[PDB]
Ligand binder design. Structure first.
Ligand SMILES: *[C@@H]1O[C@H](CO)[C@@H](O)[C@H](O)[C@H]1NC(C)=O
Ligand SMILES: *[C@@H]1O[C@H](CO)[C@@H](O)[C@H](O)[C@H]1NC(C)=O
Ligand SMILES: *[C@@H]1O[C@H](CO)[C@@H](O)[C@H](O)[C@H]1NC(C)=O
Lengths: 215, 194, 219, 215, 219, 194, 194, 215, 219
């Protein structure tokens, strides 16, 4: 059908900078493209329609251009209230509308070194029958940090899940919690659980490790 | 009174082969799309360029009604940016088509106990068709270096292949009647409106 | 000045039916078409179906075509959304949106706040909370609210007295169908045994309130 | 077997210019290539044999060169009497001789804008049962003009045939007649027949159109 | 000073046989080999077969090998070309050509004027002529000579009085096997009703002469 | 006395599927490799990084014993620089592995008259595994453009395929138990020695 | 009297396999091509470099008569610029060959009720033959990385494959005897003339 | 498994020159590579182990470097006693060790034009039933010379065999003997046996030919 | 100062067994592992099998795994190599080599002189010598020692008087399983009939001595 690619996936920008976002389609559409804005949690909001028309009540800093397959949305001077996720949506396919993947804009601050912590399962969960391990990353910037779980120095994938907090209002740094889980029979079968972290702000990878039932 | 005769198109007793896609011209008549809205027997109903809803409040210079027959699997192929036998050798659309497409099975009508072979399709052509091009040339295709001097055989094939339509055929292989309703609006008075 | 009110959202087992209501205000609901847009948790927007201004033309997305229903009552300025035989894929947030009619192509002018709909073949279950204590330059502790259904759950630290540094991680629906959530708070390493820390959580749908103490690991 | 490609297919040249024609073979032949000249209607005539030998009674302006696969025929100074079609023929395959596709040389004049006309079938042909439409191009240069038939604004291909007159002796411009034909049942089934023309001398395509039985 | 005379060309139904004659003059027909070259309408040259100077060595093209025959009579300086079981593909113009013997490789030194051969399973049919009138900066008119067989046909304007601007389009063999031809002539738009225009055509093989008036479309 | 329990690994009654490659950790025990030397029933015994002979005179920080089951044809695949189903989707080695690999048929034990299907293998994965990566995710693979929403069918496949092991299976198709013995020596005291 | 013995070549009772293409040398004798001219039983007779007609009026230093056996389909392959099994692995021509080629079916003679397998052909070779190269080496071809140490089996094939010639074989599969008559003229006296 | 490629296959060098030899593996090995030296006829000898360790009693001119897949052995100043064949062997695969193909180093002298001779079978071999033809190349440099056998001007391959003498101690030129053999029935069936030679020192190919039983 | 002595090499029919001995000296044979390396004629090295210092660990190459045997007697400082059911592929030169033990990876420190082993299902056969005379700027003559088995054979010119310019080509094992060798010597073209040339060859295993005269071809 039709697919829309929005770039970059996420960008860091500060106040007063000129931001540009590109949206590309599988095939050509003359001017059947729209730009919308949606804050975290808040409902979606319109910014630009037709790719070349400013919506009423929208600041003039937003400008749209492009035709065919590639379109651009540009902000002459960024503002604190503009830090939201922007969607680009095509309209050529009325009855099979599709939207862009989204582009979340964060505040371009200094690089924050993650604070990494490890926490073993509680004996109460041991009673239940399951086991869960928590690897915490706090106050890091940007959000692009790789978290890897090691079981007895063995890489494990897919058995945990990560959750990222929104950019903080105070220091504009993120927090990540990785929960590595398995059953009781699968927990004692191994001895060492370690959480390696790779981040831009780390000169070397940092891993927190422990041994089962040792404290 | 001055209503566009869309019924004779959709209620036509007989249709044409895809390579010989039948066309009708609609002009100087009232544009009543209610028949589409009431008709719930549409297997597929997909529009592009303009929404089907706010159409009866909109005028155009002319309307073109294309009709043909394909199989179920080829239904997806009737659209811009589509590729396949039907897409390139039997029917085509531009990159800026403006209109609607409708498709519905006609197995009860376009199938026979002995197989309905009346409908055919082009299977070979040395170049892809131009947009909205109709080709019914009976030229023998040259598939090899040896020229085909009006005779069939080695590297010489009949351009048309007949469809196999029977009541027992699969959904993707049962016949389907397909219509393309295209609206054109130029710098000329529009003689058709809702 | 446009006001839209989604309502009727809730939770139900798969295969059932649900009715959703959008209330129009400060505009002619009768003279514009309406669209329904759903957005799954963490994903983006997804078009569903659209109805004309006059309610005579109906269209739906292929993913739900022949499964949903869209209707409106211009006399009441109300928009009705019926969803029969719902699947687990239908868990998302729904919004109602105006047509706009400014072009032959559909854009989206205004949106409501939206309402939440969830599908799951599971009963409500009491949450289980577990402490997340630090060990031996500050430290941090937390609580895990795991195995609770459905959303949401309310979490506080020191009955709300502990505010700074508190981060309540977004919940996630695990393969078992339940939800798990992590709450964390960083404290200086100096104060670990003197100040007592108790995570206070309430779950109104299940009518459960639990206050769990957290103490550093000892061995 | 062996195939011979002669380039260009057709070229425009004026008197006094130096013309070059290339002929290429599928495989290598030492000197087994010949160049012949043939005027329109007149019988074929020899110019060069062996690719490096001037034929007796042939003007010295014709010169041949090349060996293996590629051969060239060059005219130092073109003359009015030299405007003919030149064939290049290989000789390595005695018992399966093959000739080139031909290269017709026209007079390099100014660009002539086609004069385009449309003519519907006569009622006499309507009585017969067939129907034919004539699209006429006259006094155009060069001959490379696309003629497209539209039935109710629908492109049709293969149902007509084009015939091109030779380059004129007076103004050196060509004439083309396209006859679009079908049966009586197929004629009234449509309403509009139009003949679009695309030519180098046309800033925009020109189409002549009419409506059935309206005059 | 070399003279060659092709003869015996004509028209016949497919599967029949035809004999063609080339008469040699002003050279030793006995001391050179002979080739037959055929050229289809609008196409280029096509080699067929070759005979030695002494008439003992014979060779033919694969397309006709085992179907044609080449023979010569040096006493008469005559070259004979027999074509048995002819196909529609054989419609073309044939030429006779000298060997030359200047190299171990065959070139072509001299050619005759050639004779025409046609194959078609159709009888001679009377031509049908139709007017091609202009409408409403000059104008142009013409006549179409369609559905006639075989070639050729003679066309004139105003019984030959109208010469300038006249273009007689080359004929083409349509799928029905017949021929159609278009004749055109441009005239100033001022003179359209005063001067009468009549295309005069004669077809000697069918013994048909027709003079058709052309008048501008009226409505 | 403080001998490493390698026997329970090689004499384990039951093994795991390759995608779920079982692991054992060996530390703070005496390194007795005589069992390998005495045991002549090894189908394949190939080491890399260090010779098997001068090992009982050498210490390491830790030992990792990997165990799984494959077919005979896949025996060659258990090695660095190897490619194949087992190489990329079920088990992997680095470009600097240091240890040994052992393989032996277990057809008498790991085959059934009705076919031993207890052992499975990953057949699809959108990316090659990282070195020493274990993946047992039950995610349905997306093979086509259409997303697989937790359901199987078109372009939606179960990631695990069960092996067909029978007494009559071919040598390359009969089950084989495979072990990887890896020795790690860091800037830490070595608690295992000969 | 001093006539070249072409008859013993064309009327030879037996022929050779293509890979072992038999050769005859013709020198110091009268060049009588009448046998070719009279003989109308030639399936194919195609010359290159010089016309067959004006040959008995032409001298050369030497003549080489190549003879072998192929199938009907391979007849086309005996020519310069040809590709195929026979073209590259069993017989070859330069880009400047000067001579003639003759071919005729010998199914009545070179076929058996049980199949005539006496004639063979090379099917593999690590490099294409040089012009007019004869190769009859019995080396086993190395098709895989594993060297073939004089033994057949995996990636080790016998270079020769025997033809299947029977009275019932197809035209392209029935045997054909092929001759190459090459004329060489150097800066030396020509001892053969018409 | 593992394959080792050593380059060049053979090189010409003089005394005092700095020689470099490269050895490449299918995959990566850290330092598990060795260099050994072996004179013609003499048993193999070690030069370098681990690719970065000089063996005791070995001249310092030999130096090793490289890791992973590519390794180099370099001689700062060549000596007459160093002219031997060098093998590079990997050690990462203890139980499937493999060695390099070998690199024989000859003395870089002036180009020597081969002296070519032809010798027919003796009548004594004719009595036996076999037939053998000898083509001799002597005093040529380098050893890279193509010897081709022609039977009646027909190229023959695989039916003979070549034997190359070691580099000479006096003039450092090689000798080659090609023995072309067949049976009695196969010898008289042809007339001319010729041995064409192609060598770097030959401006044109040189062939020695004869006719059966003519002397 | 390390001395190794291979012994026990010889020739035998395929499928038989052979024992090879390596004698150690000037080092502790007991405290190092041993490898066996074989090198085919004209090829390079090929690893076979290895034994520990203590003789308890054994390993062999796949090409011979389960076919060879390696054992040692440290009391005698002797290394034993038994090869049962030998194939024609086993014809090569074997060497014994020390372990070195300087790394966790095996290198080769010292080698013996090696011993020769051959496999062939053929009996010893008397050599056949044939002269290689020149014809009509110097000339050259030679002798061919063909159809002899096994190696080696000794060749001289003029009973050793003729030394300069003599080249004894390496032998080669032909498909028949026998050996052939060529010996050559260049002489000035002036001296061809005066000086007599006789190639003197001896084959001790077959106990055959032949002196063959060479004279220029005469006709
Ligand atoms: C077409 O036929 C159907 C019944 O087959 C009928 O209901 C419909 O009204 C017809 N179409 C029109 C435009 O009347
Ligand atoms: C494993 O079992 C075998 C017999 O099945 C036995 O010989 C061997 O000693 C056992 N392994 C150990 C370490 O004892
Ligand atoms: C070869 O044999 C045919 C009959 O089989 C005979 O006619 C011909 O003359 C023979 N060839 C010659 C050169 O005599």
């Amino acid at each position: 059908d039709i697919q829309m690619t929005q770039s970059p996936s996420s960008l860091s920008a500060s106040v007063g900078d000129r931001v540009t976002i590109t949206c590309r389609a599988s095939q050509s559409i003359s001017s059947y493209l729209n730009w919308y804005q949606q804050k975290p949690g808040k409902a979606p909001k319109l910014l630009i329609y037709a790719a070349s028309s400013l919506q009423s009540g929208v600041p003039s800093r937003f400008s749209g251009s492009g035709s065919g397959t590639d379109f651009t949305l540009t902000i002459s001077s960024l503002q604190p209230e503009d830090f939201a996720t922007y969607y680009c949506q095509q309209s050529y396919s009325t009855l099979a509308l599709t939207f862009g993947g989204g582009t979340k804009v964060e505040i371009k601050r200094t690089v924050a070194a993650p604070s990494v912590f490890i926490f073993p399962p509680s004996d109460e969960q041991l009673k239940s029958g399951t086991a869960s391990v928590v690897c915490l990353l706090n106050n890091f910037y940007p959000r692009e940090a790789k978290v890897q779980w090691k079981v007895d120095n063995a890489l494990q994938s897919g058995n945990s899940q990560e959750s990222v907090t929104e950019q903080d209002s105070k220091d504009s740094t993120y927090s990540l919690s990785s929960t590595l889980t398995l059953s009781k029979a699968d927990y004692e079968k191994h001895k060492v659980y370690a959480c390696e972290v790779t981040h831009q702000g780390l000169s070397s990878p940092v891993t927190k490790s422990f041994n089962r039932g040792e404290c | 009174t001055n209503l566009c005769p869309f019924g004779e198109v959709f209620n036509a007793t007989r249709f044409a082969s895809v390579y010989a896609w039948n066309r009708k011209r609609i002009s100087n008549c009232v544009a009543d799309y209610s028949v589409l809205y009431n008709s719930a027997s549409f297997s597929t109903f997909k529009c592009y360029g303009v929404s089907p809803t706010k159409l009866n409040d909109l005028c155009f210079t002319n309307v073109y009604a294309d009709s043909f027959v394909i199989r179920g699997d080829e239904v997806r192929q009737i659209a811009p940016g589509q590729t396949g036998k039907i897409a390139d050798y039997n029917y085509k659309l531009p990159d800026d088509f403006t209109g609607c497409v409708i498709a519905w099975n006609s197995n009860n009508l376009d199938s026979k106990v002995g197989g309905n072979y009346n409908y055919l399709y082009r299977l070979f052509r040395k170049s892809n068709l131009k947009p909205f091009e109709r080709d019914i040339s009976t030229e023998i295709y040259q598939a090899g270096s040896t020229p085909c001097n009006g005779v069939e055989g080695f590297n010489c094939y009949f351009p048309l292949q007949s469809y196999g339509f029977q009541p027992t055929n699969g959904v993707g292989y049962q016949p389907y009647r397909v219509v393309v309703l295209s609206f054109e609006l130029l710098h000329a008075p529009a003689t058709v409106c809702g | 000045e446009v006001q839209l009110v989604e309502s009727g959202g809730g939770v139900v087992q798969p295969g059932r039916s649900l009715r959703l209501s959008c209330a129009a205000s400060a505009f002619t609901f009768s003279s514009y078409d309406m669209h329904w847009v759903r957005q799954a948790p963490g994903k983006g927007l997804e078009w569903v179906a659209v109805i004309s201004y006059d309610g005579s033309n109906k269209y739906y997305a292929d993913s739900v075509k022949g499964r949903f229903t869209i209707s409106r009552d211009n006399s009441k300025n109300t928009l009705y959304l019926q969803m029969n035989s719902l699947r687990a894929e239908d868990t998302a947030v729904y919004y109602c949106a105006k047509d706009g009619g400014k072009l032959w192509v559909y854009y989206f002018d205004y949106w409501g706040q939206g309402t939440l709909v969830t599908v799951s073949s599971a009963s409500t279950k009491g949450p289980s909370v577990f402490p997340l204590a630090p060990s031996s330059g500050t430290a941090a502790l937390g609580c895990l609210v795991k195995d609770y259904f459905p959303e949401p759950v309310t979490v506080s630290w020191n009955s709300g007295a502990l505010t700074s540094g508190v981060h309540t991680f977004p919940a996630v629906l695990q393969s078992s169908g339940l939800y798990s959530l992590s709450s964390v708070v960083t404290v200086p390493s100096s104060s670990l045994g003197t100040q007592t820390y108790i995570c206070n959580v309430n779950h109104k749908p299940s009518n459960t309130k639990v206050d769990k103490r957290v103490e550093p690991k000892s061995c």
